[PDB]
């Protein structure tokens, strides 16, 4: 019975670790048209049918907010954005003082005080020649110099550059694969909570496609909740942590710019072409977004029914307007059509829930110069796009903040917030983890090595 | 009794594939002096002993115009060019205007208007002071503002130049395959643009290669073995350029009779500018030199070869170029560190039929170089003092066949093929890269011994 | 009966070669703060047990003045400094002319005319606007165009400064041979730079060495074991510098007697610039004090060591340098984040024949052309407050004057503006070899016929 420990190689092993992700795209389908920032110049093509393997007898812990792929890919997209803007054109000579007047032609009454026409002293392509250049601007990007002449917001700060209009900003569903010697695990739970074991476990070598959508309060055109509306957070007690929401059923979002915008081209220097807004044809109409109301409270009723599980089942649940702060979390933003939108979700949550004709509109704002991410050391100017844009988009989740100071476990209210897109990527990738497989192994048995 | 397959490793197999290549220099003989663009003044040298190995009983299929080594080498040459140009200074400020007057006195009556004296009111190396410089300019490099003139390329991408000690002359550059790859070449005396090669050979690494830039006549290429050779993707198609190579050298001479001087100009701190100074002596146009009887004999051989694939009674013609941009109208080469432009119509003014000793060519100089077809790059050559004199060989021609020519008679050709990928294919027409699979199997009488 | 040569593996062999070494820092001690210029953010931590063994009855020939790790090291400092400088800002707009005035705030009479009020029209946060802001500069970094001055180095390579959070303090660097290579050292404490070493030993990684920046005297590194020793490629040719290594340290204080004030300006977006502000209090010349007794007795030790290779009873003199480029002219070093320049002339006014402190002035410059290169330059950021510096002097680099007669009355001057000496003064113990584990030898082997 004097057993000997003996070598075994190639045995499956799980051990948590971190390695660099591998890009992946379905047969490089993005090559059909050029060009996209997220698809980049190139990424590796992949098999359209990765082999899903569901594991019998296997349960495994899956913990959100402890994942590191999330911030790794956060770095990946910030680097991609910087690299994409790198070959483009700097725009510093554009922020001399501007002589402006109020635009009042063919404009709706609520639309006054928004569109502005400015002229300024900017040279020509030639070294010694100056040209007079005019374009239509929005107030949200310009500030007064004195208490008139006007200047845009961001020449206190880092330099300004232009987005190259030859590459689109539309998101691309992105696949990810593990390095050699690794695999990605998929939790098969339908009602899985944020932490703890997953009684049904499966694995992949590559993950499905994820759209790098940028939104601040509303999960847009992502995945659906498979059975019921889902709520997640690190700790419900801690109000400083954000509240994830995942919808069982989506309702579309329609967002268009009714005004027919026009564009002009200006020269700065050798190989420096600038694009700016021309005169607008038609009556100036504010951008809006419409969504059905009946679906809206039905979904909030489901959300509140799920909410009451984690509180007293006889409290009062109310929703409200954002507490304030900077506009990026004060309002909702999205990129539809290659340009950004700022809409007021204040009236979205105007309702109160007690124990026991069809679509509503939201006015929206438009911004050209954008402090992308939270970054303060860089800035960009969005190129104007002519015509009339249109966006159709689902809704796939909410992101919420819970008020503090509550007592007696009654009268709970919630507000949108937490512009950390890390939350968005958690709400996308939260079905996967990275694990290292150790082929080595030494176990006792009855084998004694043959005598020399 | 039934045979079993067994395993072989290290067996010879070639497969069509593609991989990146390496530098290989002639023992780094240039290391004694600085600087050359094409060698970066340094890469891995090579031994003088690669052994060509004839492949008896072996035939091989080759194909030009689809093998990619030519294009990879083209993009490598572009990368070498802009890499050698990156560390040296730009020339942004000169897109200013120019007041100009014609160069007068001590001039040939035929050059009148070629050179222009323009001055600048530009600033100094110190940012608060203004100065006045003057320089000499070719007429081709400048365009009038509306006398006053402006540089032709300031409504396109900026032009960069500095840093003149660097040389442009070629060095023989080789390319050795990566481990697991080899080089194959075709041994026959005469070979089409495509087809099997009855006798083939393999080498570890290629011979000396020149990256020389030619527009309308091949220069310094290896001589044809037996006779004038004609190639193209398909002779019938008239969108494809035709290849011509010479069995016997045709020698040319080119020189710049003017004694030129160079001035040092300062515009920005740590930035040296060089412009052509006042020319010493009488102004005389630069020219080239080619023999008469030789040119007759070469064109006679060319038309005799052309008679093979066409009706033997067809009338052959060559002519004046068709026009367009100078890079294909004229003939251009950089010999002597200077780009030369001139006009081969004097050499193609002829026509053949069935069954003193030299010619002069008026030639031009351009200081602004939109090298290749790029629009985002530009360079201004440095003025070279003294008188430059060039000796060279001509070994090939690139022509285009005009349309029409109905009823199979009166065939004409005009110069073309302004893409130097044709030059590099006309060099590399000999070499192909293949893929080695050391693995393999085969049947045998052997079965694995038990235990 | 006849032998048969047979292959053996694992055979230890040494042979001269060269590769690139491994960066090694002591247990990543610098990771606590961001970040040293040399250590940067990343290298391999050292082995906590740098095991050393004495070679059993082995002697080896060492050839210093022929080592190549010294030049590899020199290139490595060059690369590290350029890498640190690269993600920083350019100061070309400062090349505009500066009007300057001679302003003193209770200055000392020996300090008059060294610090100037200079100002320029500068740029603003907007290219449309200009504003005049003054600053204070040393007399070294300016020049009269024909008062009005300009930066001394605007007729050469550009001036670049930024990134003040880097630390200029050296850290010892270990170096480990790559796989298949080894490092060999000489135990003999009296060993030359060259010649065979009777007592040799091998190490995996050489001991940590500070990237000491000095020109005239070696600072703040290793000591000679049992006496001072002197080395030179050939004691005959005068073109070679004379190395001196001390066995006992010499303590040094150097200080700047005034606090410093710093103001920041924004020449452009992301282009904050730090300049010297007004200095309060009395203006006193920076200088150094050092004990006299140690100086003269250590010089006596050095003369006793030096007399060995001459025929004795020969006069030995040291003297004021002959001048030249300021880098070799004055003793320069950095401490407290500021570069120094000191006149060691007063240290050597004495001759030698058979049978409690000293002061010396110094100087400060802010535009430094690193090493002998002229294509790169840097502006030092002002360091706030009073700089206090303590250090040990571990050696001296010397040069011998040519001429004289009768092999008598030998005179010496400091020299050797090549910091290669600074690195080799400690790299001269170590040497690298290649190991070929394969080996063959005859034996009675006859492989079993099958």
């Amino acid at each position, epitope marked *: 019975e004097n057993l000997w420990v003996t070598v075994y190689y190639g045995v499956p092993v799980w051990k948590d670790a971190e390695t660099t992700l591998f890009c992946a795209s379905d047969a490089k389908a993005y090559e059909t048209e050029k060009h996209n920032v997220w698809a980049t110049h190139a990424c590796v093509p992949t098999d359209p049918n990765p082999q899903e393997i569901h594991l019998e007898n296997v349960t495994e812990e899956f913990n959100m907010w402890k994942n590191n792929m999330v911030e790794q890919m956060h770095t990946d997209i910030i680097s991609l954005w910087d690299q994409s803007l790198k070959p483009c054109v700097k725009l510093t000579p554009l922020c001399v003082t501007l002589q402006c007047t109020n635009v009042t032609n063919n404009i709706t009454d609520d639309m006054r005080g928004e569109l502005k026409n400015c002229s300024f002293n900017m040279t020509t392509e030639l*070294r010694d020649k100056k040209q007079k250049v005019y374009s239509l601007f929005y107030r949200l990007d310009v500030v007064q110099i004195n208490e008139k002449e006007y200047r845009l917001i961001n020449c206190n700060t880092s330099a300004i550059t232009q987005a190259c209009p030859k590459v689109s900003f539309e998101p691309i569903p992105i696949h990810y694969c593990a390095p050699a010697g690794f695999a990605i695990l998929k939790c098969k739970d339908k009602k899985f909570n944020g932490t703890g074991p997953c009684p049904s476990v499966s694995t992949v070598q590559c993950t499905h496609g994820i759209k790098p959508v940028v939104s601040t309060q509303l999960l847009l055109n992502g995945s659906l909740a498979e059975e019921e509306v889902m709520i997640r957070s690190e700790n419900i007690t801690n109000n400083a942590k954000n509240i994830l929401v995942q919808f069982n059923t989506p309702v579309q979002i329609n967002c268009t710019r009714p005004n027919n915008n026009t564009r002009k081209s200006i020269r700065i*220097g050798p190989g420096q072409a600038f694009y700016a807004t021309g005169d607008i044809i038609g009556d100036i109409r504010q951008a809006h977004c419409n969504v059905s109301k009946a679906t809206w409270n039905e979904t909030l009723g489901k959300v509140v029914k799920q909410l009451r599980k984690h509180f007293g089942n006889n409290t009062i649940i109310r929703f409200a307007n954002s507490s304030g702060g900077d506009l990026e979390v004060t309002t909702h933003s999205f990129n539809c059509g290659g340009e950004f939108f700022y809409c007021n979700t204040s009236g979205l949550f105007n309702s109160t829930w007690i124990s026991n004709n069809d679509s509503i509109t939201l006015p929206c704002r438009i911004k050209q110069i954008i402090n992308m991410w939270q970054r303060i050391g860089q800035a960009m100017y969005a190129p104007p796009i002519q015509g009339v844009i249109r966006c159709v988009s689902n809704i796939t989740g909410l992101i919420l903040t819970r008020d503090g100071g509550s007592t007696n476990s009654t009268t709970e209210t919630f507000r949108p917030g937490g512009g950390d897109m890390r939350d968005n990527w958690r709400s996308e990738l939260y079905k996967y983890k990275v694990v290292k497989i150790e082929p080595l192994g030494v176990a006792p048995t009855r084998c004694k090595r043959r005598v020399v | 009794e039934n045979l079993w397959v067994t395993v072989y490793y290290g067996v010879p197999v070639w497969k069509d594939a593609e991989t990146t290549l390496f530098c290989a220099s002639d023992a780094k003989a240039y290391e004694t002096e600085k600087h050359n663009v094409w060698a970066t003044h340094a890469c891995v040298p090579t031994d003088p002993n690669p052994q060509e190995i004839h492949l008896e009983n072996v035939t091989e299929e080759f194909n030009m115009w689809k093998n990619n080594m030519v294009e990879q080498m083209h993009t490598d040459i572009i990368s070498l060019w802009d890499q050698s140009l990156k560390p040296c200074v730009k020339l942004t400020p000169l897109c200013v205007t120019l007041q100009c007057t014609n160069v007068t006195n001590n001039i040939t009556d035929d050059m009148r208007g070629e050179l222009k004296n323009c001055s600048f009111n530009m*600033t100094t190396e110190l940012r*608060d002071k*203004k100065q006045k410089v003057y320089s000499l300019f070719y007429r081709l490099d400048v365009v009038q503002i509306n006398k006053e003139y402006r540089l032709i390329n300031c409504n396109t991408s900026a032009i960069t130049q500095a840093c003149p000690k660097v040389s442009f002359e070629p060095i023989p550059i080789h390319y050795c395959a990566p481990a697991g790859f080899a080089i194959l070449k075709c041994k026959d005396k005469k070979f089409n643009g495509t087809g099997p090669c009855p006798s083939v050979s393999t080498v570890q690494c290629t011979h000396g290669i020149k990256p020389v830039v030619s527009t309308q006549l091949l220069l310094n290429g290896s001589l044809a073995e037996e006779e004038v050779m004609i190639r193209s993707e398909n002779i019938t198609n008239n969108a494809k350029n035709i290849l011509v190579q010479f069995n016997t050298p045709v020698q040319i001479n080119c020189t710049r009779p003017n004694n030129n001087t160079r001035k040092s100009i300062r515009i920005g701190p740590g930035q040296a500018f060089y412009a052509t100074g006042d020319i010493i002596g009488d102004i005389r146009q630069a020219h080239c030199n080619v023999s008469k009887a030789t040119w007759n004999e070469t064109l006679g051989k060319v038309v005799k070869q052309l008679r093979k694939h066409f009706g033997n009674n067809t009338i052959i013609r060559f002519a004046n170029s068709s026009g367009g941009d100078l890079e294909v109208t004229t003939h251009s080469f950089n010999c002597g560190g200077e780009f030369f432009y001139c006009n081969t119509s004097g050499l193609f003014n002829s026509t053949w039929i069935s069954n003193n000793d030299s010619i002069t060519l008026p030639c031009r100089i351009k200081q602004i170089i939109n090298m290749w077809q790029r629009i985002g790059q530009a360079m201004y050559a440095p003025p070279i003092q003294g008188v430059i004199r060039c000796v060279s060989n001509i070994t090939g021609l690139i022509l285009t066949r005009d349309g029409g020519s109905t009823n199979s008679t009166t065939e004409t050709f005009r110069p073309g093929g302004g893409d130097m990928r044709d030059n590099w294919r006309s060099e590399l027409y000999k070499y192909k890269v293949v893929k080695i699979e050391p693995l393999g199997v085969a049947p045998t009488r052997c079965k694995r011994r038990v235990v | 009966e006849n032998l048969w040569v047979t292959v053996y593996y694992g055979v230890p062999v040494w042979k001269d070669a060269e590769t690139t070494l491994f960066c090694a820092s002591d247990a990543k001690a610098y990771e606590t703060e961001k970040h040293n210029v040399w250590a940067t953010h990343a290298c391999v931590p050292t082995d906590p047990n740098p095991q050393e063994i004495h070679l059993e009855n082995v002697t080896e020939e060492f050839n210093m003045w022929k080592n190549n790790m010294v030049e590899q090291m020199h290139t490595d400092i060059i690369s590290l400094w350029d890498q640190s400088l690269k993600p920083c800002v350019k100061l070309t*707009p400062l090349c505009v002319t500066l009007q300057c005035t001679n302003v003193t705030n209770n200055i000392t009479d020996d300090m008059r005319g060294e610090l100037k009020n200079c100002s320029f*029209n500068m*740029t603003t946060e907007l290219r449309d606007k200009k504003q005049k802001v003054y600053s204070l500069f040393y007399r070294l970094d300016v020049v009269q165009i024909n008062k009005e001055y300009r930066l001394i180095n605007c007729n050469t390579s550009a001036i670049t400064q930024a990134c003040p959070k880097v630390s200029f303090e050296p850290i010892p660097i270990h170096y480990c041979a790559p796989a298949g290579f080894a490092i060999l050292k000489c135990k003999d404490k009296k060993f030359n730079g060259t010649g065979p070493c009777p007592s040799v030993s091998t190490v995996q990684c050489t001991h940590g060495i500070k990237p000491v920046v000095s020109t005239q005297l070696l600072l703040n590194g290793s000591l000679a074991e049992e006496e001072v020793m002197i080395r030179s490629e050939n004691i005959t040719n005068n073109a070679k510098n004379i190395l001196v290594q001390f066995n006992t340290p010499v303590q040094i204080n150097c200080t700047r007697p005034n606090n410093n004030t710093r103001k920041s300006i924004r020449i452009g977006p992301g282009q904050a610039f730090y300049a010297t502000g007004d200095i309060i209090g009395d203006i006193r010349q920076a200088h150094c004090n050092v004990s006299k007794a140690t100086w003269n007795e250590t010089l006596g030790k050095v003369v006793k060591q030096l007399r060995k290779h001459f025929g004795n009873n020969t006069i030995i003199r040291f003297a004021n340098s002959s001048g030249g480029d300021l880098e070799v002219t004055t003793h320069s070093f950095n401490c407290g984040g500021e570069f120094f320049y000191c006149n060691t002339s007063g240290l050597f006014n004495s001759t030698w024949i058979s049978n409690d402190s000293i002061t010396l002035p110094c100087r400060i410059k802010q535009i430094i052309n690193m090493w002998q290169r002229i294509g790169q330059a840097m502006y030092a950021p002002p360091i706030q407050g009073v700089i206090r510096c303590v250090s040990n002097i571990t050696g001296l680099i010397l040069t011998r004057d040519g001429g004289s007669t009768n092999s008598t009355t030998e005179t010496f001057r400091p020299g050797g503006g090549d910091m290669r000496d600074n690195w080799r003064s400690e790299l001269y113990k170590y040497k690298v070899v290649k190991i070929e584990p394969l080996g063959v030898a005859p034996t009675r082997c006859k492989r079993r016929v099958v």
Partner: antibody
Amino acid sequence: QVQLVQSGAEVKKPGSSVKVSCKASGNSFSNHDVHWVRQATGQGLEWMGWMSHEGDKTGLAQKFQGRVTITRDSGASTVYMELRGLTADDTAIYYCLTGSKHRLRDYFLYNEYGPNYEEWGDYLATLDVWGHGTAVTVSS
Amino acid sequence: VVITQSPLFLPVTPGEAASLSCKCSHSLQHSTGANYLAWYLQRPGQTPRLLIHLATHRASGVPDRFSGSGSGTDFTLKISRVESDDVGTYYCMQGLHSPWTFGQGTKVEIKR
């Protein structure tokens, strides 16, 4: 209106130097270009000198080079003229006045990594309210 | 650059339109097209006064009877319905090129 004050009439010997003064209420010199104009009875008008309202640029008639100078007090509340080498023919009336100008850029090099090269051109707009003037006569 | 005014003086019949002429050696037009010319009338016994500035528009408070014209090098100043309070001396200035100068002057006087 801004009040202008000038020195009184003076009798001076030939070949000597003469000093004069001027003053404007409210220190309008900061906002208005300084000028100095002579006129002789029965002849046309000639400008002698000028000083910018910023006090940054000055100019003299080429006939008066080496004999005149431009001065002002601290704060530019007053201005003083020194006239040298005067003979009997320089006897005339001397006037202190303000004016308006145009400060416009002529040439410019836009610099990506520094301030633009710039040169300005000063061009007169109009000559503003005159002073009462001063009469200077030269005699033995 | 030199400038001329013509005529030196002219008799005037009261209540009748009249014109004055000023000429210069070089064009007054600026690279931006701006003209730099202002006419000034000086009463004997007092200082001149601006009439028209920069060849386009009369000065503030100037009666409509004044009118200016001309371009480049030649310019004219026409006054309609001249009366007794118009007798005096008229000057054209220079504002394009340093140094700034004035014309030789024209004298308007009632005919007698």
